[PDB]
Tab-separated table of N, CA and C and ligand atoms in Angstrom:
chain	number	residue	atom	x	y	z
A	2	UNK	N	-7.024	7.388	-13.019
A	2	UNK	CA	-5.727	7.420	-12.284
A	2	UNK	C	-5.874	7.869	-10.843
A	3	UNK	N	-4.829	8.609	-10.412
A	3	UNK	CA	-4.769	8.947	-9.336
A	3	UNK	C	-4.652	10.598	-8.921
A	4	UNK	N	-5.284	11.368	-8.295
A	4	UNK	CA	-5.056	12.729	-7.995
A	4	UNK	C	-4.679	13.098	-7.193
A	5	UNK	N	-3.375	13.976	-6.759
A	5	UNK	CA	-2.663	14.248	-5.560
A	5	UNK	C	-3.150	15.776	-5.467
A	6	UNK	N	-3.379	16.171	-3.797
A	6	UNK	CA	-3.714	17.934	-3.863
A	6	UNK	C	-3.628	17.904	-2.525
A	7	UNK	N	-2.363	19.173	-2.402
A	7	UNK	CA	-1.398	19.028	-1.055
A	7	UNK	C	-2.528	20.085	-0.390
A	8	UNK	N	-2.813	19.664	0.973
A	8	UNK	CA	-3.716	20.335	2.132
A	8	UNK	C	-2.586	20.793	2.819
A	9	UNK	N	-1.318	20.227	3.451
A	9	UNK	CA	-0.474	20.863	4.258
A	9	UNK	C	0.859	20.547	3.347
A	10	UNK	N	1.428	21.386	3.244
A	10	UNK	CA	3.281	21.147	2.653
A	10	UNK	C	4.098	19.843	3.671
A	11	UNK	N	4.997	19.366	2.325
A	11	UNK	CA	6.277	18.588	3.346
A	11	UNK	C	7.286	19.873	3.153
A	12	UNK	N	8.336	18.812	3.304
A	12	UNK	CA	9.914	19.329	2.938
A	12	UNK	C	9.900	19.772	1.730
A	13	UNK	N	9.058	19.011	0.871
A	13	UNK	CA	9.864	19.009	-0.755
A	13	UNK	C	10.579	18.751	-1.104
A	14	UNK	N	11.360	17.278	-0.346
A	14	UNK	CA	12.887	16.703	-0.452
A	14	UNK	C	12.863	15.562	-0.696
A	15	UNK	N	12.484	15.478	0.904
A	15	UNK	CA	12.195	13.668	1.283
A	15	UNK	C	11.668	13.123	0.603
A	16	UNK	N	11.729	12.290	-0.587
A	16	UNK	CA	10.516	11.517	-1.003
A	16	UNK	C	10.715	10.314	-0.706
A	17	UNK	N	9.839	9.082	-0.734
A	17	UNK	CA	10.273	7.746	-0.245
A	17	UNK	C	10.828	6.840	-1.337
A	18	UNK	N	12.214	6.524	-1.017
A	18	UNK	CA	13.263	5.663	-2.438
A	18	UNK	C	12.141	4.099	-1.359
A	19	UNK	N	12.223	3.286	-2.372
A	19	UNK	CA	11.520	1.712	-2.513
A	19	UNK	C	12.693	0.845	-1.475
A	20	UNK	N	12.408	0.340	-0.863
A	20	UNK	CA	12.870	-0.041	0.114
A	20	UNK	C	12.225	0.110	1.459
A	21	UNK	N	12.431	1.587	1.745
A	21	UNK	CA	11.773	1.987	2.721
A	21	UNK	C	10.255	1.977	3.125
A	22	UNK	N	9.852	1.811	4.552
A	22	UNK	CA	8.764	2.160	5.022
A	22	UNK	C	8.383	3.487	5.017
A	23	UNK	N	6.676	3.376	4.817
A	23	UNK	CA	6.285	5.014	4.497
A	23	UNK	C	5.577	4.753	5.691
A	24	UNK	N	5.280	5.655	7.302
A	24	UNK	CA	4.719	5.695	8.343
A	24	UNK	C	3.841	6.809	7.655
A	25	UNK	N	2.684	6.360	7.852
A	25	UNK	CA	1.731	7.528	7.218
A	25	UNK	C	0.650	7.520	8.363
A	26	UNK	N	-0.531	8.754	8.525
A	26	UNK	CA	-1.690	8.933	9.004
A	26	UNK	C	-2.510	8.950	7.701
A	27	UNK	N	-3.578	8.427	7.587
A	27	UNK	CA	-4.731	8.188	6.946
A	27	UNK	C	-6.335	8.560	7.548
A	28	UNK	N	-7.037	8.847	6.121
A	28	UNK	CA	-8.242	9.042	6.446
A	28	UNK	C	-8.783	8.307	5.091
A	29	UNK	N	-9.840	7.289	4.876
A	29	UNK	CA	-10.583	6.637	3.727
A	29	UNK	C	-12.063	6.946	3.663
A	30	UNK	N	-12.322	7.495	2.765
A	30	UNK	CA	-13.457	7.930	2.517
A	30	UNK	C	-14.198	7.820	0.522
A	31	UNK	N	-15.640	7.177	0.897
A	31	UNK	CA	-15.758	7.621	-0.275
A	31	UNK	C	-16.411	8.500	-0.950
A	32	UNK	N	-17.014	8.163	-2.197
A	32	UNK	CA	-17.061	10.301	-3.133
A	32	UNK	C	-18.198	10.585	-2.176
A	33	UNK	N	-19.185	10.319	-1.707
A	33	UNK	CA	-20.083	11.222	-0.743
A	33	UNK	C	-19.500	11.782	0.349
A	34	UNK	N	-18.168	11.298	1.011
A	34	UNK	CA	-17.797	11.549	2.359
A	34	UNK	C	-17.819	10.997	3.031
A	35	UNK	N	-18.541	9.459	2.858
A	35	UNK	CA	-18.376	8.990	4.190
A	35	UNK	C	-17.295	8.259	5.024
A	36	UNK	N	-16.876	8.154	6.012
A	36	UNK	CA	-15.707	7.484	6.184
A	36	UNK	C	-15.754	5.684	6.169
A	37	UNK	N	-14.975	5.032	5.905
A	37	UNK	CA	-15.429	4.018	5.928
A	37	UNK	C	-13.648	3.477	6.328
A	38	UNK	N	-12.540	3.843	6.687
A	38	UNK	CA	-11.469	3.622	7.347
A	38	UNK	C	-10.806	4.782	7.585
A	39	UNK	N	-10.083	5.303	9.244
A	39	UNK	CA	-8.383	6.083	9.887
A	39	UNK	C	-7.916	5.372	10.841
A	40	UNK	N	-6.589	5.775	9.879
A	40	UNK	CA	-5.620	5.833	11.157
A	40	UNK	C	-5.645	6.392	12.637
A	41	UNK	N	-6.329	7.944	11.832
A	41	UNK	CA	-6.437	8.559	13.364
A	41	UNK	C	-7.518	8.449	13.767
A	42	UNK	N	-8.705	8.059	13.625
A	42	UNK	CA	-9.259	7.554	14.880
A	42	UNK	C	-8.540	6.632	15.814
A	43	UNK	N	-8.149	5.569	15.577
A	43	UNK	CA	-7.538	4.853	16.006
A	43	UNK	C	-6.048	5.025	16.941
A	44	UNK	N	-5.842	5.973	16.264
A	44	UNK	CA	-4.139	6.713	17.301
A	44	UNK	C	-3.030	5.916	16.950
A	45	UNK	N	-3.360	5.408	16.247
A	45	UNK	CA	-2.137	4.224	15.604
A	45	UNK	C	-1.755	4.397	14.073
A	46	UNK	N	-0.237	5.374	13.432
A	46	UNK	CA	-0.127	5.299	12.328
A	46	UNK	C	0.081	3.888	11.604
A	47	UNK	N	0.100	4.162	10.384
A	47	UNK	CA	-0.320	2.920	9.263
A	47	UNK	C	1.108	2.665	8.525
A	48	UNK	N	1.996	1.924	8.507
A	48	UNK	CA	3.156	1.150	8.301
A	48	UNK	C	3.077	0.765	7.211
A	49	UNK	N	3.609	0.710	5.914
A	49	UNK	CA	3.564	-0.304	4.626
A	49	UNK	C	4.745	0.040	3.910
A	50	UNK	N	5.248	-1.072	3.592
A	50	UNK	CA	6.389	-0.593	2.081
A	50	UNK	C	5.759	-0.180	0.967
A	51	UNK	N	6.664	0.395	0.276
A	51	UNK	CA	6.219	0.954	-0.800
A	51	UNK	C	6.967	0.120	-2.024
A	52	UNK	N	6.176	0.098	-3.626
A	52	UNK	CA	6.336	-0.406	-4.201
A	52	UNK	C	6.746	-2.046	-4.697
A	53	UNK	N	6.252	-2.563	-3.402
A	53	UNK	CA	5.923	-3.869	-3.519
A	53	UNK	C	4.594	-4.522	-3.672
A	54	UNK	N	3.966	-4.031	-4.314
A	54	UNK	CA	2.231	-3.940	-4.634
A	54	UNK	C	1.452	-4.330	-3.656
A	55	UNK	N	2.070	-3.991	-2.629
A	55	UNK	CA	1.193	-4.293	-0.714
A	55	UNK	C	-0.059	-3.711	-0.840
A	56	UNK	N	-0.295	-2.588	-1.553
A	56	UNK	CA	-1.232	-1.691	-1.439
A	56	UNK	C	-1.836	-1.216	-3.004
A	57	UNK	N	-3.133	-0.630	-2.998
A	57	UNK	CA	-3.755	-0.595	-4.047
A	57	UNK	C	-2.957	0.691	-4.891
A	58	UNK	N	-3.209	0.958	-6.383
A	58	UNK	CA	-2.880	1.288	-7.306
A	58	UNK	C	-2.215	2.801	-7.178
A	59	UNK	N	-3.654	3.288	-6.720
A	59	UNK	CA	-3.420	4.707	-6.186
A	59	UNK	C	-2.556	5.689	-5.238
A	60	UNK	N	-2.628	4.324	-3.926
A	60	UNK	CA	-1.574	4.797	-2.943
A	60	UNK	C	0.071	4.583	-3.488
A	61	UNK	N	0.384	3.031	-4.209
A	61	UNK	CA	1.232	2.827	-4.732
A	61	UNK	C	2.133	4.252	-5.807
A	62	UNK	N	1.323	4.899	-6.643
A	62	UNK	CA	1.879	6.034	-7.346
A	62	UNK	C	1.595	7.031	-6.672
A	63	UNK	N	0.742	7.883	-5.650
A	63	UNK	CA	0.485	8.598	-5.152
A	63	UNK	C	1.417	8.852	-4.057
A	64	UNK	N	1.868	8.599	-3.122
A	64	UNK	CA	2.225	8.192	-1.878
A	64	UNK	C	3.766	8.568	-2.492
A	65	UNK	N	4.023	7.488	-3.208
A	65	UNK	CA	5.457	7.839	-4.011
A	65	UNK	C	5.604	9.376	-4.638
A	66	UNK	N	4.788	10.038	-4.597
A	66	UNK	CA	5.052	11.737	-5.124
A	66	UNK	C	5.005	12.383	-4.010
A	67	UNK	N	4.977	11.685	-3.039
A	67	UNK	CA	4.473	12.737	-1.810
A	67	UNK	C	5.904	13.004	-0.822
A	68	UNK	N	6.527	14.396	-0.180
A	68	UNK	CA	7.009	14.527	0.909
A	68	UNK	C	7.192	14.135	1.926
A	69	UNK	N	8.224	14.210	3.102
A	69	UNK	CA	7.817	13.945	4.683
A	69	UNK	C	7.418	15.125	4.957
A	70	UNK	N	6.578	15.034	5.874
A	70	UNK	CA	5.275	16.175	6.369
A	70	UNK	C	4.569	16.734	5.779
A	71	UNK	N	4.413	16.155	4.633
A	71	UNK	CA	3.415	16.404	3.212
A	71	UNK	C	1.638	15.608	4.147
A	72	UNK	N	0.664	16.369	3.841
A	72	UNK	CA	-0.911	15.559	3.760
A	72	UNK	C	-1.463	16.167	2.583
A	73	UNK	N	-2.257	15.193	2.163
A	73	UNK	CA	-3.153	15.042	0.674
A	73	UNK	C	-3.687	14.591	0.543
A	74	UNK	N	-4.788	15.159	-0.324
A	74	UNK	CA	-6.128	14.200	-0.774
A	74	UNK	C	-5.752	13.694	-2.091
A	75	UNK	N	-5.867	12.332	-1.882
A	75	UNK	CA	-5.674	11.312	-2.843
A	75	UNK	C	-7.656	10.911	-3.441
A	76	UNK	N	-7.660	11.535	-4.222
A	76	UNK	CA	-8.918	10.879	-5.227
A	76	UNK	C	-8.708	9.923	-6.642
A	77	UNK	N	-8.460	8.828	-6.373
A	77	UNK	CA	-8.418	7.234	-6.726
A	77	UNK	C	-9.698	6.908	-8.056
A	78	UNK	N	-9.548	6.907	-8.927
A	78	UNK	CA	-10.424	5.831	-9.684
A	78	UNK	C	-10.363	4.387	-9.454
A	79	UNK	N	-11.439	3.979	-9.638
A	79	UNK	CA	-12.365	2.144	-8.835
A	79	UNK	C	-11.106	1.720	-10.037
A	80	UNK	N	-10.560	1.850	-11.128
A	80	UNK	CA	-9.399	0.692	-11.410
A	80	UNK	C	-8.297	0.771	-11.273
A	81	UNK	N	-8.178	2.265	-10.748
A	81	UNK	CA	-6.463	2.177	-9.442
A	81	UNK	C	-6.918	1.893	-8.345
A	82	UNK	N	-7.618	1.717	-7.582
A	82	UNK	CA	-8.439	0.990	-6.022
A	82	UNK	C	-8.589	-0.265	-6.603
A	83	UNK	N	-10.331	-0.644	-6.266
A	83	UNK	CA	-10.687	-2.313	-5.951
A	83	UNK	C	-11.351	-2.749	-7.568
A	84	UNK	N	-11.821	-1.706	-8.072
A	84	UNK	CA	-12.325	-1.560	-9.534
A	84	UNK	C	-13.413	-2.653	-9.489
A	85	UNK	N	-13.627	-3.354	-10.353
A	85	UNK	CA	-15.259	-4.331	-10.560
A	85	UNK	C	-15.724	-5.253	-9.022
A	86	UNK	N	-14.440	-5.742	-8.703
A	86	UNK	CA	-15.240	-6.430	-7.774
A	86	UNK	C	-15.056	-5.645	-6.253
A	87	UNK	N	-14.456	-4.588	-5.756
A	87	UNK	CA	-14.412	-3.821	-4.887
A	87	UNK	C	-14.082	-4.735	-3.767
A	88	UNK	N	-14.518	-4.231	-3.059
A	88	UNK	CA	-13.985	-4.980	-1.356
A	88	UNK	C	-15.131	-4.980	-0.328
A	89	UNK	N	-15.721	-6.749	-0.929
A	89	UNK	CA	-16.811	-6.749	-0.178
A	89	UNK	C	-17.208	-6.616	0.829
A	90	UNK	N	-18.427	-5.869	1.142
A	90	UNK	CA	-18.476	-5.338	2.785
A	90	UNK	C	-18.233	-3.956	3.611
A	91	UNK	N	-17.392	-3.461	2.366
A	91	UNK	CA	-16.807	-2.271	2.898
A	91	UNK	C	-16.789	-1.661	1.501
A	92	UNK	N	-15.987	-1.224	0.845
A	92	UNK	CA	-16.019	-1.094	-1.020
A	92	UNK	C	-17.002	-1.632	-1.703
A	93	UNK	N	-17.851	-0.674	-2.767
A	93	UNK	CA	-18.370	-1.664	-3.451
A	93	UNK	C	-18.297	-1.951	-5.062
A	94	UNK	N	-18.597	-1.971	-5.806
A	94	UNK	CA	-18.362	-1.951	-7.298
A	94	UNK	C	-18.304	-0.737	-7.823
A	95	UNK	N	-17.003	-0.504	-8.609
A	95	UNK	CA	-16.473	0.661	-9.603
A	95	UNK	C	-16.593	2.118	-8.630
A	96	UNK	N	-16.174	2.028	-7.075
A	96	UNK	CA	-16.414	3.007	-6.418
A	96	UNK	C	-14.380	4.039	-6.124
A	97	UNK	N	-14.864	5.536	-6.600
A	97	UNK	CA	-13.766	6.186	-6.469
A	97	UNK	C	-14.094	6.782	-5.364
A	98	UNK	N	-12.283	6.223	-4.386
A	98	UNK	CA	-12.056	6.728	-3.407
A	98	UNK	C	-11.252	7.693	-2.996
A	99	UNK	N	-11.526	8.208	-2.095
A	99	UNK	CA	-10.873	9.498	-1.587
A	99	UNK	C	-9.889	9.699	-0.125
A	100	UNK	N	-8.730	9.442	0.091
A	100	UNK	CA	-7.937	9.630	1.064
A	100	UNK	C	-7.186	10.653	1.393
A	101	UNK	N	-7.366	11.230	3.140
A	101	UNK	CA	-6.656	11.807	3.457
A	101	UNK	C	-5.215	11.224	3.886
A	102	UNK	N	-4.525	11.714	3.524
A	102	UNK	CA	-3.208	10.792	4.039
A	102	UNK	C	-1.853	11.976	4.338
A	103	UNK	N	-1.364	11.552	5.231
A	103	UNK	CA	-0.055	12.468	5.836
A	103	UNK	C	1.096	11.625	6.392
A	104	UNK	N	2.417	11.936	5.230
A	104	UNK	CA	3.331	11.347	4.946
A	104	UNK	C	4.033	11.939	6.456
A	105	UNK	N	3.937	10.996	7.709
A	105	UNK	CA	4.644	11.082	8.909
A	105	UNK	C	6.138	10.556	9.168
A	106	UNK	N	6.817	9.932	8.719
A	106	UNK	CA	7.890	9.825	8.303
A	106	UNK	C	8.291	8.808	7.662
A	107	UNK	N	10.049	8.299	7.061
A	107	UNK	CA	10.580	6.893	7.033
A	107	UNK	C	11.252	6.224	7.620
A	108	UNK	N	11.492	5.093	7.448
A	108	UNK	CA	12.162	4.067	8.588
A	108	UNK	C	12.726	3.088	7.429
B	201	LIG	C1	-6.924	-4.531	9.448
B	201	LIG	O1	-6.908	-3.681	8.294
B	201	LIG	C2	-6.467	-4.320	7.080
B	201	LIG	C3	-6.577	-3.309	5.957
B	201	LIG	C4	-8.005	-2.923	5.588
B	201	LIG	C5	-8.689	-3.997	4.725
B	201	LIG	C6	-9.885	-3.391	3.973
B	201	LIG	C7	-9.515	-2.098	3.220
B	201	LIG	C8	-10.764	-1.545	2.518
B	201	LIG	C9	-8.897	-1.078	4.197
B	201	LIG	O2	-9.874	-0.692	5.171
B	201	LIG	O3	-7.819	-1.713	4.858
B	201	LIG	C10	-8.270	0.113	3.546
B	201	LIG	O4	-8.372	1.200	4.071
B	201	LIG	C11	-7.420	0.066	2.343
B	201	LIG	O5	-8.046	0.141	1.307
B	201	LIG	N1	-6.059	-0.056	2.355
B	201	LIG	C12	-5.308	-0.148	3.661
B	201	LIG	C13	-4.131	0.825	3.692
B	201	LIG	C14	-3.232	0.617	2.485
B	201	LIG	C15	-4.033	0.844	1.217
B	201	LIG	C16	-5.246	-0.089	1.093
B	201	LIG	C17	-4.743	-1.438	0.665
B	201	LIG	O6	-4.314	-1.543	-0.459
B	201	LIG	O7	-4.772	-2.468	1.518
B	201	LIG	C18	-4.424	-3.825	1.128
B	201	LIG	C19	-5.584	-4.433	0.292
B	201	LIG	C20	-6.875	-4.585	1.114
B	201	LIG	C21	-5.297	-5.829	-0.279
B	201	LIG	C22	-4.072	-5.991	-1.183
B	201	LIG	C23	-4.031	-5.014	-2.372
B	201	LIG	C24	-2.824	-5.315	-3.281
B	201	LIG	C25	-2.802	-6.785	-3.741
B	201	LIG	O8	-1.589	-7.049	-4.447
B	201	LIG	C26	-2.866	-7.727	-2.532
B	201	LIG	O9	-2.911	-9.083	-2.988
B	201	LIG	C27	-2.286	-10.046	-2.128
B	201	LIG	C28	-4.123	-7.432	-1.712
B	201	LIG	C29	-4.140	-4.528	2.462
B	201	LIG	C30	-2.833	-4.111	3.134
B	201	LIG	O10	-3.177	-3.105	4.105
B	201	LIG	C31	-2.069	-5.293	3.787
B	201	LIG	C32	-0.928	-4.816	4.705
B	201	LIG	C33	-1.500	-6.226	2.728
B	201	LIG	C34	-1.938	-7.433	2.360
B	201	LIG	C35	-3.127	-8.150	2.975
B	201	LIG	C36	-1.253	-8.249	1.263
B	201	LIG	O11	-0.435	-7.477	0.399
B	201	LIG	C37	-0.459	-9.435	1.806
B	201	LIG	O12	-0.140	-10.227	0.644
B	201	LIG	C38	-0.017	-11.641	0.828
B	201	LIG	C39	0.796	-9.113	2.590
B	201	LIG	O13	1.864	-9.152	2.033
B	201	LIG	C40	0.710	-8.809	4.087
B	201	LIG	C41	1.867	-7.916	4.619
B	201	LIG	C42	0.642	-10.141	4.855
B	201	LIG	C43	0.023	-10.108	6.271
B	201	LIG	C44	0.069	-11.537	6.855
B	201	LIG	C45	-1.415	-9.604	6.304
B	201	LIG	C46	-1.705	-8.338	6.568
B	201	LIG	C47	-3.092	-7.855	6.557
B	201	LIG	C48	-3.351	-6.603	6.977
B	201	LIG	C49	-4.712	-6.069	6.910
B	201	LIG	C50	-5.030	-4.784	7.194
B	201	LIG	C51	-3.969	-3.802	7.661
């Protein structure tokens, strides 16, 4: 499944109802650490609806438990992520990933 473990507090209110956009900061990494995708390097937060299966398994239920001004490490099993065939090039087979992510607001 999926593991949520709050590094900084939100509100404890806000959560995101389906409809809405979740503006998040991200960090992707896998179980050794290495990074392999952020947002913040880049300086540009990461935009997606929620619960329209835009996004893999983990963020989909994870993300949805999370606050505004909530960050967390999301640790993902490979069959809530990319699971057997991973994401070639970047992901690779049955690999659990690990995201920093910080619920920046909704829209
Ligand atoms: C330029 O960057 C890449 C993302 C890279 C690509 C490589 C990744 C390893 C990783 O580096 O992101 C990564 O960090 C990651 O794992 N992310 C990203 C953050 C959200 C969680 C997770 C993550 O789930 O991403 C997702 C799965 C890759 C594919 C999807 C998993 C669920 C499954 O149902 C989808 O089947 C169709 C495939 C990619 C998403 O982001 C984007 C926004 C969504 C899609 C490509 C599809 O939904 C698509 O459908 C037809 C759409 O509707 C979009 C809105 C259409 C539009 C024309 C194309 C947008 C493409 C954007 C590409 C982006 C932003």
């Amino acid at each position: 499944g999926v593991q949520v473990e709050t590094i900084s507090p939100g509100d404890g209110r806000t959560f995101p109802k389906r409809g809405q956009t979740c503006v998040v900061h991200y960090t992707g990494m896998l179980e050794d650490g290495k990074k392999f995708d952020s947002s913040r390097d880049r300086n540009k937060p990461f935009k997606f609806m929620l619960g329209k299966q835009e996004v893999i398994r983990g963020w989909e239920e994870g993300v949805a438990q999370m606050s505004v001004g909530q960050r967390a490490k999301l640790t993902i099993s490979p069959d809530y992520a990319y699971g057997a065939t991973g994401h070639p090039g970047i992901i690779p087979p049955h690999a659990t990933l690990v995201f920093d992510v910080e619920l920046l607001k909704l829209e």
